[PDB]
Design a protein around this nucleic acid. Structure first.
Lengths: 82, 95, 97, 106
DNA sequence: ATCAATATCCACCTGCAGATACTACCAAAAGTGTATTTGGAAACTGCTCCATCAAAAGGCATGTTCAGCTGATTCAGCTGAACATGCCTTTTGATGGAGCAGTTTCCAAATACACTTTTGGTAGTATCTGCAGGTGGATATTGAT
């Protein structure tokens, strides 16, 4: 029963996210749009974090790699160091 | 009667290289000068941070290179990286 | 035989999830996706557990806020149903497009 | 006595760039290759923009690059647009762009 | 309206995950003292360019008219919410090993430093040139009919 990883981001899970965002009613096409948006979000951030990993000569992406990538994308995160 | 540096003559040199019969207005030059300063500050800054993050006191062409990859989009990064590598490689063999 | 009307449970859920702070995507599937995306930038990577966690926290905060904007965009057009064109508008105005 | 610019094969002043890195308080030390690499990236970028802007000037039957030409060059190029996504070029105006539903008839 | 299903509220119970208190320790700040460097306020003044003002040059304010857009109304049909459960994916925890991180090492490359050369900026005076804004005069575009 092979399944694409992005589809692992399921309808109910996207439904829950919308709910926290105060959304009452959701169009069937929203689930695919959301996955695309998440993909671009993660590409942009992971790209930069990996770039930090490579610079340090590591094979492990660290929380700090991620925290620094988030800071420069203007999405500062508190709770994981720095 | 204090001296005020700019990248003007260098911008003009490069301009003649690419469009030998084209000039530049002083306002356009002012904008070119601002752009160069701006990108300089953005790359040096990333380099600065990167160095701090790795507990290093030295900014080397390696720091600049990561800064370039962090700052520039896709294809501009790729090409800036070649041009910078090329210049340093050439520079190393030239003394 | 008992049946709640459309929107009744949806409200009940908005209240529920606005009260809590747990992550709403299952950890494992999110982790696979992260690794898949990263594989295109560098092969044979390992991830600190907290690194994945950081990414999930950031990704879920992002999407939650995007849904709020999206919801305003639906309501601006006098609807109560969110559509991709609402997500699209929100991203264009945010300057992500 | 050959300039460090000519040594690296560059128009942009490597000396000047080395100096600005020191005065700029970016780290304790500046490596010798840093201003070389940086000056080249700087030179590359300005060649990219003057190329495109020169074209806009020609397209406009003009011989002198003005700020409108820099704007057209930057906004018409996906990557320069994103790189200067939060920058304003004075006297650049905007790209001609009218939304569909605004046009007459059907 | 009544009525019954089911969600929600609260008081009380408790095991343990996560908070905290305590001791012995050491490397490493943080502080104290003395010898040395310099950054910048102040005091003076050349001189750029800002506020100010008078005449000239063109955009703004206003009222009338109606085209067509917005918002209300109604309606049918499409499309997403609600629903119940065993399949199947995720979570939990137990266990080898990869690699991050701590440590010592030693030299390529860093800073410092002092005469020596080069050059980018400006400043005073000169001649050049791209194109803005004026013109007339041939080619659309638009809206009445």
């Amino acid at each position: 029963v092979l399944r694409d990883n992005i589809q692992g981001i399921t309808k109910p899970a996207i439904r829950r996210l919308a709910r926290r965002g105060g959304v009452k009613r959701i169009s069937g096409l929203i689930y695919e749009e959301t996955r695309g948006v998440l993909k671009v979000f993660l590409e942009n951030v992971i790209r930069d974090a990996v770039t930090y990993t490579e610079h340090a000569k590591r094979k492990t992406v660290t929380a700090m790699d991620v925290v620094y990538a988030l800071k420069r994308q203007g999405r500062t995160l508190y709770g994981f160091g720095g | 009667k204090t001296r005020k540096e700019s990248y003007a003559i260098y911008v003009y040199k490069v301009l003649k290289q690419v469009h030998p019969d084209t000039g530049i207005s002083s306002k356009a030059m002012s904008i070119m000068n601002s752009f160069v300063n701006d990108v300089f500050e953005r790359i040096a800054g990333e380099a600065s941070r990167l160095a701090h993050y790795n507990k290093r006191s030295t900014i080397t062409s390696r720091e600049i290179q990561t800064a370039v990859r962090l700052l520039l989009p896709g294809e501009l990064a790729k090409h800036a990286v070649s041009e910078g590598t090329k210049a340093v490689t050439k520079y190393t063999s030239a003394k | 035989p008992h049946r709640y009307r459309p929107g009744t449970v949806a409200l009940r859920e908005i209240r529920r999830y606005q009260k809590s702070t747990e992550l709403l995507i299952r950890k494992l599937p999110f982790q696979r996706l992260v690794r898949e995306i990263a594989q295109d930038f560098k092969t044979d990577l390992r991830f600190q557990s907290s690194a994945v966690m950081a990414l999930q926290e950031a990704s879920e905060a992002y999407l939650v806020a995007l849904f709020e904007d999206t919801n305003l965009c639906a309501i601006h057009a006098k609807r109560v149903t969110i559509m991709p064109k609402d997500i699209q508008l929100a991203r264009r105005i945010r300057g992500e497009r | 006595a050959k300039t460090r610019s000519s040594r690296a094969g560059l128009q942009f002043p490597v000396g000047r760039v080395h100096r600005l890195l020191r005065k700029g308080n970016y780290a304790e030390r500046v490596g010798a290759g840093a201003p070389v690499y940086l000056a080249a990236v700087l030179e590359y970028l300005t060649a990219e923009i003057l190329e495109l802007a020169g074209n806009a000037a020609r397209d406009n039957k003009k011989t002198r690059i003005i700020p409108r030409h820099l704007q057209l060059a930057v906004r018409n190029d996906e990557e320069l647009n994103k790189l200067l996504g939060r920058v304003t070029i004075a006297q650049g105006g905007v790209l001609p762009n009218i939304q569909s539903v605004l046009l007459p008839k059907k």
